[PDB]
Amino acid sequence: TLPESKDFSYLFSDETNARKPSPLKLFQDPNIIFLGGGLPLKDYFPWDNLSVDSPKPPFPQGIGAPIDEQNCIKYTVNKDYADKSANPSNDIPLSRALQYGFSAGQPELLNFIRDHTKIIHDLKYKDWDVLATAGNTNAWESTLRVFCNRGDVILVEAHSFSSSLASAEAQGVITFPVPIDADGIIPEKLAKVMENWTPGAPKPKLLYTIPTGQNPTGTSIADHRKEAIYKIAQKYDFLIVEDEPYYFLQMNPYIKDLKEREKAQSSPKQDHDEFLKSLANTFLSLDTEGRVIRMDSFSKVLAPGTRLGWITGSSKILKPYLSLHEMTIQAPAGFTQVLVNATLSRWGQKGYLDWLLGLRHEYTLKRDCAIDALYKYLPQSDAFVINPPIAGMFFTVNIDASVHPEFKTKYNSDPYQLEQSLYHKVVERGVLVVPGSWFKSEGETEPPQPAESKEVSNPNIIFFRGTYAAVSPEKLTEGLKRLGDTLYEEFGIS
Amino acid sequence: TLPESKDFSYLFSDETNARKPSPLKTCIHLFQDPNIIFLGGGLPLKDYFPWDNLSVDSPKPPFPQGIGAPIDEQNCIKYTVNKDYADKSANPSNDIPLSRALQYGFSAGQPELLNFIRDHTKIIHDLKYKDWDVLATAGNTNAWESTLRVFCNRGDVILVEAHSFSSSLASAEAQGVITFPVPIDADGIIPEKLAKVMENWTPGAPKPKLLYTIPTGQNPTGTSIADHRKEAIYKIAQKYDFLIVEDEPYYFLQMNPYIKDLKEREKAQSSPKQDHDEFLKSLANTFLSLDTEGRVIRMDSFSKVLAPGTRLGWITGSSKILKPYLSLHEMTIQAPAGFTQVLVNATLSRWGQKGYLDWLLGLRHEYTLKRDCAIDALYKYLPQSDAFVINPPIAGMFFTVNIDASVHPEFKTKYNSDPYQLEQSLYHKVVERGVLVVPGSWFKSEGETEPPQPAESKEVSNPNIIFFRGTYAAVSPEKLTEGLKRLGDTLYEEFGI
Ligand SMILES: Cc1ncc(COP(=O)(O)O)c(CN)c1O
């Protein structure tokens, strides 16, 4: 009924095309005596009866409540189970989690992830699958190895995640920046970059985007924009790699008027159907061809130290990723898979939505606190633009450098020089937010792209990224007060 | 005091030289700072991490019933690791709290775990330069991947054993790294032959950046490089300026030599177990212990010691050499899974360095039994002409059956005098008998330089000898013995011997 994915192997790197798996890869087969692979006896693995406490859906006191008493699910995973009847929650037994094998991920884990995938997204082609990773850092590294030769070109957001950019730069992959605004990638500008792409220059292989709660701008690509960008990717034949660690940091609408906000907060909470309907569309759900690779992580949902995530893409696309994983990480840590699977399986798909609803709630409160402080403590004028993010853990403080009294004299109309001195001046006041320039994508092709493709809107706008994820409301508010005080003083505003 | 490592940065790959870490990395150190409010990270609240009170059972030193005994009754330690500790005194065991294991940070590995590893390092090795350190990895598979990224551009050359680990070779091949084979025998790498390869290295050809070696329980040959040979090999490395990467996942699978006479063995196995001092004295010297310059990189793994799915190992090397590996890790794999580090640290710390030696002695005992069983069966079921050679391994989990393909009746005719042809025949015939072994050619290193090396450097010692690698680690004594009966019989039948 659904079409098969397209074959994009013509985009595979030289390393991918050269990679041949070790022929040294039946152990469970009753009739074969296994004298081949060095699989050590599970009798020697020095752990049994792994137990833990996890909070209990629907997390009535908030997802941050102490884990005990009635807010507590308790369980134990054994090394071996006598019969399938002794394993009702379908845990990954330690004997299997701790033995070589299952480089794509343990099947119980991937089954939970596939079921979750079907709830969250609407898949438009037949042969999609998932592959477990050690997180989105790992997934992006693998994506570069799989597709990009030194000197290949990718498209990136004009400001993007510092590590992803650094990773591509180390490999000599050209990161060509495309324009973004308050609603993320601007499709018309993207289209123009492609239509005017200099003949002779390497064709971009893929677009690397963080569509929801963009790092660092905090923006989200509007649904209609994702549709227009997907069409551009089809017309110019590039893949879309969506890095989505913040997808579930989508928030309830920012409401500036406090009385209006209290009324809205007084209303019943979202049910599961309302939650799902409120979520942003995804490039995965738009993909009819298998040209989208989505990178998901448990870092911001469960914990950064889980070191576990997954990729979703076509069965065709996932082949070289699995071959690479087999020769690099091998498989995500068995214990992390056991504990993530066990907790998620007990929550169930529905209990996991309750968890994600709790996560949404906590972030909303943090965001409101941040934005309230900015409206209260920053100078209020066209020079200081505040965009309340609708998703993510980041906000930006935007500054028109050209309004500084010494921009022309002291700073030689150089916005970067002003940014750098404000950074120090802010740290001297006792708050650290991070310079926009650290996230600025830079790339050039041979032969070069035309002038129009290099344009920057508002070249005198500088910004700082802050986050509301990590600190108390009191510390957040005080930090932003200090920052705002610095800006008044520094800008000669009364 | 001790000398400082040498700077080998001239060996770093182009990718390594181009990798620049973010100024953002600096900032992530200003979290707990109380004078600067830090709104510059992306560290989610530990309040939301959905686990607390991680508990498990582990076996108990000195493991008197064997390291494979059930984890229960007396052979059982129980512990519980909390997410947070009210104060350090509510944490007497010095566990990595979950709130820290599961947060971003410590990309080199959690301090408690690295401290245990450093203490262990000092017990096992005799270190001879000042700035050695350790870095946690996701295992030797990833450590080798990382080594190739750090040092080798496409077209660079490394030296490898004539027969080596199939996966290491395939990793190098995928990256276009030339793997130039050097000769080995019953005692591992032959230093005189290695020295000649370097002496005769063709001017203008890429000079080797490193030797990749599996010195103890070599995969696949099962050999151990003699103490004096390591000393010689290290000198060659100093002379021709290459690094030594010792891939050592089988180091603690060393065994007493195989005693052929059963009476001679019963009385020797009658003597009480090694104490820790005789255990340590019995261990092979390491390239790490020879290193006075930081030219050695050791790759260690908990895979064969604790379990493969731990996905945890470490690299030992100079602070200078570890710097680009950490920079690469921060952009790739990041730190090993927090839960793996918590559970490995928690179990090892409670065993202590001494209980961990008891464990490793228990591992030696189990593999010794397995080796004896295998080698005994080979002497019972294999033909005993000069055309069938068994070298009983002193280390590791593999044995080989070396066979002169030439002595086969239908060799000239059915296989047109082609050893590889015979090897693939035998291999499928054996699997058809219900026993899985591995053809030796899957391990054969191949590489060439431009301009080519001279012919002396390319010589092979009678290409009519084929081999099969078997393992005694994975199955029961009874299955191992049956497996090797079928194999020895197949050989008897096939050679009409
Ligand atoms: C020489 C060698 N290196 C590495 C490994 C595996 O290392 P790890 O399981 O630590 O990734 C093996 C066996 N799988 C090996 O024999």
UniProtKB/Swiss-Prot annotation, chain A:
Domain of life assignment: Eukaryota
Any Pfam family the entry gives: Aminotran_1_2
GO biological process terms on file: aromatic amino acid family catabolic process; aromatic amino acid metabolic process; L-methionine salvage from methylthioadenosine; L-phenylalanine biosynthetic process; lysine biosynthetic process via aminoadipic acid; tyrosine biosynthetic process
Main location: cytoplasm
UniProt keyword Cytoplasm present: yes
UniProt pathway: Amino-acid biosynthesis; L-phenylalanine biosynthesis; L-phenylalanine from phenylpyruvate (ArAT route): step 1/1; Amino-acid biosynthesis; L-tyrosine biosynthesis; L-tyrosine from (4-hydroxyphenyl)pyruvate: step 1/1; Amino-acid biosynthesis; L-methionine biosynthesis via salvage pathway; L-methionine from S-methyl-5-thio-alpha-D-ribose 1-phosphate: step 6/6; Amino-acid biosynthesis; L-lysine biosynthesis via AAA pathway; L-alpha-aminoadipate from 2-oxoglutarate: step 5/5
Keyword entries, A-Z: Aminotransferase, Cytoplasm, Phosphoprotein, Pyridoxal phosphate, Transferase
Cofactor section: pyridoxal 5'-phosphate
EC number: 2.6.1.39, 2.6.1.57
Enzyme class, spelled out: transferase
One GO location term (cellular component): cytoplasm
Reaction(s) this enzyme catalyzes, per UniProt: an aromatic L-alpha-amino acid + 2-oxoglutarate = an aromatic oxo-acid + L-glutamate; an aromatic L-alpha-amino acid + 4-methylsulfanyl-2-oxobutanoate = an aromatic oxo-acid + L-methionine; L-2-aminoadipate + 2-oxoglutarate = 2-oxoadipate + L-glutamate
Residues with Phosphoserine modification: S95
Compartment(s) of residence: Cytoplasm
Keyword Cell wall biogenesis/degradation among record annotations: no
Gene Ontology MF: a single term: 2-aminoadipate transaminase activity
Note: Present with 1770 molecules/cell in log phase SD medium.
Role: General aromatic amino acid transaminase involved in several otherwise unrelated metabolic pathways. Responsible for phenylalanine and tyrosine biosynthesis. Active with glutamate, phenylalanine, tyrosine and tryptophan as amino donors and with phenylpyruvate, hydroxyphenylpyruvate, 2-oxoglutarate and pyruvate as amino acceptors. Also active with methionine, alpha-aminoadipate and leucine as amino donors when phenylpyruvate is the amino acceptor and in the reverse reactions with the corresponding oxo acids and phenylalanine as amino donor.
Similarity section: Belongs to the class-I pyridoxal-phosphate-dependent aminotransferase family.
Protein name in UniProt: Aromatic/aminoadipate aminotransferase 1
Species the sequence originates in: Saccharomyces cerevisiae (strain ATCC 204508 / S288c)
Origin organism lineage: Eukaryota, Fungi, Dikarya, Ascomycota, Saccharomycotina
The gene coding this protein: ARO8
From Swiss-Prot, chain B:
Residues the record lists as Phosphoserine modifications: S99
Keywords: Aminotransferase, Cytoplasm, Phosphoprotein, Pyridoxal phosphate, Transferase
Classification via Gene3D superfamilies: Type I PLP-dependent aspartate aminotransferase-like (Major domain)
Subcellular location(s) of the protein: Cytoplasm
EC numbers, comma separated: 2.6.1.39, 2.6.1.57
Annotated catalysed reactions: an aromatic L-alpha-amino acid + 2-oxoglutarate = an aromatic oxo-acid + L-glutamate; an aromatic L-alpha-amino acid + 4-methylsulfanyl-2-oxobutanoate = an aromatic oxo-acid + L-methionine; L-2-aminoadipate + 2-oxoglutarate = 2-oxoadipate + L-glutamate
GO cellular component term of the entry, any: cytoplasm
Gene Ontology MF term list: 2-aminoadipate transaminase activity; aromatic-amino-acid transaminase activity; pyridoxal phosphate binding
Top-level division of the source organism's lineage: Eukaryota
Chief location: cytoplasm
Annotated metabolic or biological route of this protein: Amino-acid biosynthesis; L-phenylalanine biosynthesis; L-phenylalanine from phenylpyruvate (ArAT route): step 1/1; Amino-acid biosynthesis; L-tyrosine biosynthesis; L-tyrosine from (4-hydroxyphenyl)pyruvate: step 1/1; Amino-acid biosynthesis; L-methionine biosynthesis via salvage pathway; L-methionine from S-methyl-5-thio-alpha-D-ribose 1-phosphate: step 6/6; Amino-acid biosynthesis; L-lysine biosynthesis via AAA pathway; L-alpha-aminoadipate from 2-oxoglutarate: step 5/5
Requisite cofactors: pyridoxal 5'-phosphate
Pfam family membership, one: Aminotran_1_2
Single GO BP term: aromatic amino acid metabolic process
Family indicated by similarity: Belongs to the class-I pyridoxal-phosphate-dependent aminotransferase family.
Protein's job: General aromatic amino acid transaminase involved in several otherwise unrelated metabolic pathways. Responsible for phenylalanine and tyrosine biosynthesis. Active with glutamate, phenylalanine, tyrosine and tryptophan as amino donors and with phenylpyruvate, hydroxyphenylpyruvate, 2-oxoglutarate and pyruvate as amino acceptors. Also active with methionine, alpha-aminoadipate and leucine as amino donors when phenylpyruvate is the amino acceptor and in the reverse reactions with the corresponding oxo acids and phenylalanine as amino donor.
Protein name: Aromatic/aminoadipate aminotransferase 1
Originating species: Saccharomyces cerevisiae (strain ATCC 204508 / S288c) (Baker's yeast)
